Design a protein around this ligand. Structure first.
Ligand SMILES: NC(=O)NCc1ccco1
Ligand SMILES: NC(=O)NCc1ccco1
Ligand SMILES: NC(=O)NCc1ccco1
Ligand SMILES: NC(=O)NCc1ccco1
Ligand SMILES: NC(=O)NCc1ccco1
Lengths: 348, 348, 348, 348, 348
């Protein structure tokens, strides 16, 4: 007995949609949902989506409140739709997927993922929900996450972190590391060997290794000395060059975090969404050095160091494909006289 | 079990809210309510009110579909709120009253009119609904309509016409003439002697008397000759003078209807609402004669002749108070040498 | 003492802005202005402009309520702004000009047209307002309209019709024929010889000559016989050809009006504005003959016969420039063997 | 002479409405008020209310800029409307009350609180404004605040803090502690003996006692040791349990503030308004422990300690009613073997 | 080949408009521009302007990404429009100017600044763009900025800081100090001798002199002692008096920054725009001292000290005009017995 008033009742009483019965009076004004709390209207939801306000309200209330894969992972895996849940994209304030399966009558393409409409779409299955491993086995296309072993299915250990209600974290009270499985045209596809982005912030960047502790504490020339990084252009790539009008390098989040403690800078996120590689229009406030498209990736410094050190430095310029977050990230390697000039996530 | 989806279900299946169970999928976009009909959205309601779109949708769906008093009558009687119904104002595309009683949880001030909040307000009671005559008897303030006699209560025979779903008509299959009763502070009132406006349209004006048939068929000087209207300025007041830049007179709907058959004109209804007297910015398309505020009243021509004939034509200018539709309508009488110069609903 | 509440007071009490003092309570919701009339909101204005709702409300309330030149005439004369008035464009539900002079503080570029900002702009002056003939004499650029003679200034007799509150009419109670004067860079211009469009409607088309009476009453081959129009393609140009999938000709409003009495058709006005030549996507409902861009001009049939009769019918195709409404209208003349094939307002 | 342009003039020149004369040109676009400052529009107000944009602009400009009671206090006291002022709810970006008394013609139910419409409503009176103590004496329903003694009226000393322009503070340059008085149906009602919430923030939480200094500085088991809090479940209730998927306890703001220094967490305020007890959907970022409805109250730790220590621990579960902010806050006490299991503001 | 889809392509691929060819599918919803990134909409721009959403999107994408003069400087110089660029006002989230020159067809008054429409307007020229010095020489009105010498043109050294993408900074990798030139009616106007505001923030205020280091570190009476500021009311003017209900003085940003470290306060920026002198409704959170209009100027403390020390203290009250940011800032000097009582940017 689905209704706007019942969704609002659940938001008010349960903090989210929890299948409870009841209704609260709602008023909809423009793109905002309100509820009368003792005579005055209290805002429950502000629609930031391209969907109708009441439709987005229900989808947001029916969002998965369990730790789920980050949208970038789901996207790199080709996920089109989720099975009997809504993955909320907190970075875009919108549902990660256009349609639903057994969630909301306005966005539903099917009630069960076994319906023919779902066969050509890569449905996301959560092995933590009863019957979803079997639904994945019978689904023509899908992505499955589990907490343990699935008999006969070869696992792909995913990232340590998951998104819980918009918070990217490595779980201690909850499991955030999942086993990943994919199916393309009824066939279980072998997921590639891959690195994972660390999903850290600039404001609260914490080192996750001794090399990262040394990078943040030590001076530039003495960190490079310790880790044998001479001839690998870390001064340009990771530390960044703020001497000319165009900002040089600065493509690893760890290098932005180090700069951040000394002096502030503006990162204009002109395509605000979750992605393995992010693009920013960066303006350094101390020097005035700036760059319209500064591609930034949050790799564990040891992982980036391993990627660059295992590259041949004999060619002037080549494309270096690295599998990060299950996707092939093309990088652009530029060399001269046996030393790296620059190495950056390739702008397409 | 009130819900947006259930109201929409009733609109879709029953043409209005009919207490039926069921839900249809709704999407709200801006000020418009839509329903999915086999994949595509179909518009159900366009909010023209100052209330939230979903709230106005429910009030409109819960409108009285029986012949009810015209909003102008209810307004002249001081009606603030209706009992367990919504009087839809089709001229304003909005509810006639701000609040409701046992209709919609967002607009309800009470569920039953017997609650203390309703005592100071003039509640509208419909004797055609079971128990409303008694509720009126125990209500401090109220206006009652009945089809027949109420024991002990002296009636006021209201207008012949009522509004059925926005159509003002004199019923043949339905009763449209009601008995009116009013109570102020527990005291049953003696409703004054009143004339009634005929609520006719310009496009479909029909004469309701022999004098009105003669006015529409006969020429100006020969109608006035027949009805001894010499010296009462009907040439100015009713027929209208289109010879000067400012349109002279034309204050009776019958005179606008007669002009309408010969040549067209524009009536700009700058305050669109139901009222005993209406104001228009009239532009005559044939001559170009115009007037910013031309007050127009639809009185039965015999009634308007009785009012003008029962006046003292000896003062230059005076205010002539006439009870029309239960309200006191001030008119402005202008005379010279014992003859009327002009007589029009007072602009104030 | 300009205010939203005062403008609304004038709209409510005077039918338009009339410099009266007073205020009424206003509420603005989306693009609509409302006023409280005894507890409920009554719509006063719906903004159809690209200006802010309160700004457009004031400009509309301050519109010229006297018969004024049609927007197409003002436009063909290069009028940029009006002096101390607002010419309301009733076809676009918007002000005819972007800025004002001494009208509204939000749109005003100057209070008086004598200010330097107005010198490069063609200010519209109305000789019917005290002091505007003199203001025109001292204005560098301007267009003047008068009812009678201006000493020393040679006049151009404008069209018979003017727009009074959105109604295009030939005045009987008011003067609608003006004398036109134009000045470019201080030099009084000699306005060219021009024809005028008749500004008629399809629903209420009235013949303004004996040739037009004969065209509407007589049959095709017998009207052409009477007026010696053999070889001038009137069967195609004026009457229209509805035998093929593409509608042939039908470029003169008189021919659309004649078709209209027999069978209906849809005219999609895809660029809704006032112009000498209008373009419509016409679909004939009887035959299904249609045309995406059917240019239509309302010329007096005698004027259109004079234009076609005074052409050289010896070249296959040429551009025929005709001055209509003071503007140069290009027509496309197509001939074969000394007879007209087609003649239509040039699509460019 | 109230107007949109005059309100805007006062906002621009006086920082708020100050009864000054003058007008500034305003443009209204969507839900935003703008003023032309040297040719370009500058935003003055963004409507976050369910009221029309110009109406909310005036109410916000006419907000009380003196230290006033917090909305939660006014709400717990049953305040419906304020007398000749607007209490701005800075937490909801909206007026605390639906209607006004002698403030704005669009929201006014009366000009003076002595009018009959105000008798059934609890009007808020400010003894700091001349004549408001007397108005309270003659008001059937009301809440009064004073800075000192009112002859014959028994006072209720309120909270130390008040809201000054959105800032909750304990005044030093201004008085923030008021005397409270209430009237229900013409009878002065004895306000209850009550505790008060401390109205602190998480970001800037400061201890207001030695017990609170000890709680924030000392370790868990050594604070409990010092204050004899063994067997009272402070480890669960105040400190919080982040070991399981559902976050245990954490119902006192002081415990959230202590957690905040060590590790961050997200508090989703799904009903954003001022209330004695607040509900949050909390997600701990370090552990991933979370709770959909975590009720949180900011009591002085000594006050909470006194509340819990004065409870009988013989029953498995009972409702414990505590008067906080003049309202009866129901708590749920759970015990086992003579020790407290949990104690939390009861979810209704 | 300008288009919405091409602007969006440039925003997506180049971080801003860069003249590149290509199109990305766009959807416009309300006041927001979106792009489909793998099936879901990603927000590219939120219109905060009074211009149409697609128009403001193009202007923002076409904003000057080089260090440009701060809007307050341009405004004090009388700049109306920029030549072949858009100066984005990041404080108002809108273009600094109403119209453009060769930027966007919807806002363009001309394609080149040499067109007659531009002659009466003060066009902004950037000597760093080829041909703009010459365009300034031929422009009737204009403001020019250069990086070096212009033959024959007497320079005015401007402020050290410029705005680069919204960031006010003193350039190290880029030049931010420009030479300024002005022309009024074809005549090069001598720019006045002036002080400059330091354009600092409260959150990140850094001293730019030894006097400013001493002010922030030293106590009140010992700073005044060192700098001989006795009898100059710095205790009131710069430090601020928080003892009475109305906040005393506090008109220099350095004094707000010093207060900020000790205790927080709210600055309501009721006219949010760039100006030499800013007005705030300040509420001190510790004391509750407040002021509706507290004018604040960010002058280098040495510059303010020099301004006040060079004033005659013989008159009770006088207007002190100081040229700051090329504009005459009127200050109000109040004296008694040879000592300063108060000195503040004069409220007009
Ligand atoms: N990342 C990873 O461990 N891939 C191995 C795999 C096995 C089956 C699917 O992927
Ligand atoms: N309020 C008032 O004056 N009412 C008049 C009345 C009371 C009873 C009958 O009429
Ligand atoms: N700008 C221009 O070329 N104007 C033509 C003109 C000037 C005077 C009379 O005509
Ligand atoms: N909180 C408190 O002090 N109550 C006592 C009281 C006296 C009159 C009304 O309340
Ligand atoms: N500020 C300044 O240096 N003014 C001198 C000047 C010379 C020409 C124009 O201004």
């Amino acid at each position: 007995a689905m209704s706007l008033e019942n969704v609002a009742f659940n938001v008010v009483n349960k903090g989210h949609f929890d299948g409870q019965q009841g209704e609260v009076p709602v008023s909809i004004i423009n793109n905002t949902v309100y509820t009368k709390v003792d005579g005055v209207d209290v805002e429950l939801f502000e629609n930031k989506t391209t969907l109708p306000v009441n439709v987005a309200f229900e989808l947001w209330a029916k969002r998965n409140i369990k730790p789920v894969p980050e949208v970038k992972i789901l996207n790199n895996l080709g996920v089109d739709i989720a099975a009997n849940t809504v993955i909320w994209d907190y970075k875009r304030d919108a549902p990660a997927h256009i349609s639903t399966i057994g969630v909301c009558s306005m966005t539903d393409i099917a009630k069960k993922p076994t319906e023919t409409i779902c066969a050509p779409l890569t449905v996301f299955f959560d092995g933590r929900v009863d019957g979803q491993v079997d639904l994945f086995r019978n689904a023509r296309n899908g992505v499955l996450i589990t907490e343990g072993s699935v008999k006969g299915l070869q696992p792909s250990v995913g990232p340590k972190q998951a998104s819980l209600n918009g918070v990217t974290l490595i779980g201690e009270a909850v499991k955030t590391q999942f086993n990943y499985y994919k199916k393309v045209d009824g066939v279980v596809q072998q997921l590639p060997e891959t690195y994972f982005t660390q999903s850290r912030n600039l404001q609260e960047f914490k080192p996750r290794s001794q090399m990262e502790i040394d990078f943040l504490e030590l001076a530039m020339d003495e960190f490079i000395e310790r880790y044998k990084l001479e001839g690998y252009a870390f001064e340009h790539i990771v530390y960044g060059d703020f001497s000319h009008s165009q900002l040089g390098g600065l493509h690893l989040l760890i290098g932005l975090a180090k700069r951040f403690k000394e002096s502030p800078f503006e990162l204009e996120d002109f395509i605000p969404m979750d992605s393995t590689v992010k693009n920013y229009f960066i303006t350094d406030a101390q020097t005035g050095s700036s760059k319209c498209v500064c591609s930034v990736i949050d790799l564990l410094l040891d992982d980036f160091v391993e990627i660059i050190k295992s590259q041949d430095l004999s060619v002037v310029s080549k494309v270096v494909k690295v599998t990060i977050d299950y996707t092939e990230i093309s990088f652009m390697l530029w060399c001269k006289d046996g030393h790296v000039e620059t190495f950056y996530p390739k702008l397409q």
